[model samples]
Target: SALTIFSVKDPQNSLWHSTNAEEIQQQLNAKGVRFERWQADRDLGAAPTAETVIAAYQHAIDKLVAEKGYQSWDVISLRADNPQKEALREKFLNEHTHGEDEVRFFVEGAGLFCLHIGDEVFQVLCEKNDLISVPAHTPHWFDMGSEPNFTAIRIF
Candidate 1:
């Protein structure tokens, strides 16, 4: 039986995110593996436009690939306050691209993924206990809303 994260305080196998992007990168690098870093950004779940959301992820992916030659990627866990992410909502603040498919494991909360492939937009809503996979160079984006949310893990 899987325990609800909030229901069980301090779950033994649980993890926490770094205070900032720099530290987040450090954690990955210290592992003697690949690493990437960005900036300290938080969304308040202000209900943004869809175009804005997709663009964010696309942009982020572009940078990550350029900087680190990242191939496939993964989105760990993500969270929000009262406003949980869904297939529809608003644009994301950050966007990026990858050389290969993207994978994400939801350890907490939920998020919406708007994947734009040429003229198509594939909306994926990820909740806790869910893991999503986006195919190679699919041109996708993620929106967390404008709120202080926490996600357990991600990679690319």
Candidate 2:
């Protein structure tokens, strides 16, 4: 999930304005959206430890918590073969925002977290082992597709 953003100034479904991480952050930041990417423990076959996580990423996580005052953390998992695909998708696939930073560390699978900013829409394809933080009050939506499979850690 390195970055594949398309500016909505172009026609629908066009990738003409494809850009990288820095540009998107600048654009989104002005519109009150915070976008960030962190690559977490990549190997899923083995378990990960808090010490390892902290050792691997000290500055980012610490700065985020220290500066943003995150109070809690949690994990959520959704499988592709879920029975309530329609209901789950319906509930999540709407444009909404959070009162606090919407932070997630992906453990498995993939999905798209789309952000709507003025005339442009950034569709962030979040895959296994990726972490993202969306600022509070930023209108956005998520799509785990029809299959709906992924596990992620969430922080508040």
Candidate 3:
């Protein structure tokens, strides 16, 4: 299930948003962000290689590149078995932003992204089939959770 939580920037409060795709997209769009989901069309396998995963979603990947003029892309896969799991989670948990948009297509598993906009924050749970484009310079943090098990293609 996909969900979004909206709250004040202050840490003491816990305000959330209960919404469908329409509402979620609308709210995110208002903040210069993009949230969407696709049917995937094909599976990338339980343990897929970068080449295999990219090949499976070539059409969508190509479209994005053409539309956004992305320079490069890569696939990131993480699991409980990975020795750097803790380090990865730690690194992503800290709020940060990119010089360019952070575009990602989730191939498997799930992750949570919290975006801190003006005076409010939006927490988005991004799962399989979810493609989120967080605009450049947007303050946000990602939580892949412990025992992470997800594969995502990131475009820059």
Question: Which candidate number would show the highest lDDT if scored against the true structure?
Answer: 3
Candidate whose TM-score is highest = 3
lDDT of 3: 0.72
TM-score rank order: 3, 2, 1
Candidate 1 Cα RMSD (Å): 13.3
Against the hidden reference, what TM-scores do the models get? Answer: 0.40, 0.66, 0.83
| lDDT at residue 148 of model 2 (Cα atoms) | 52
lDDT of 2 by residue, 22-64 (tens): 7656755766655566655455345444444334444555654
Q: In order, what lDDT does every prediction score?
A: 0.43, 0.60, 0.72
Model 3, 29-147: lDDT tens digits are 87787776767768766687788887777677776645556766778777667688889877767776788876888876677766776666566677776688888877767676575
Worst 10 residues of 3 by lDDT: 1-10
Per-residue lDDT tens digits of candidate 1, residues 13-52? Answer: 3334223445533533343323333332434255532344
Candidate 2 weakest ten by summed lDDT: 47-56
Runs of candidate 3 exceeding 4 Å displacement:
1-13, 65-68
Query: Where is model 1 poorest over a 10-residue stretch in terms of lDDT?
Result: 1-10
Task: Between candidates 1 and 2, name the one with more favorable TM-score.
Answer: 2
Stretches > 4 Å off in candidate 2 = 2-16, 19-37, 42-63, 80-82
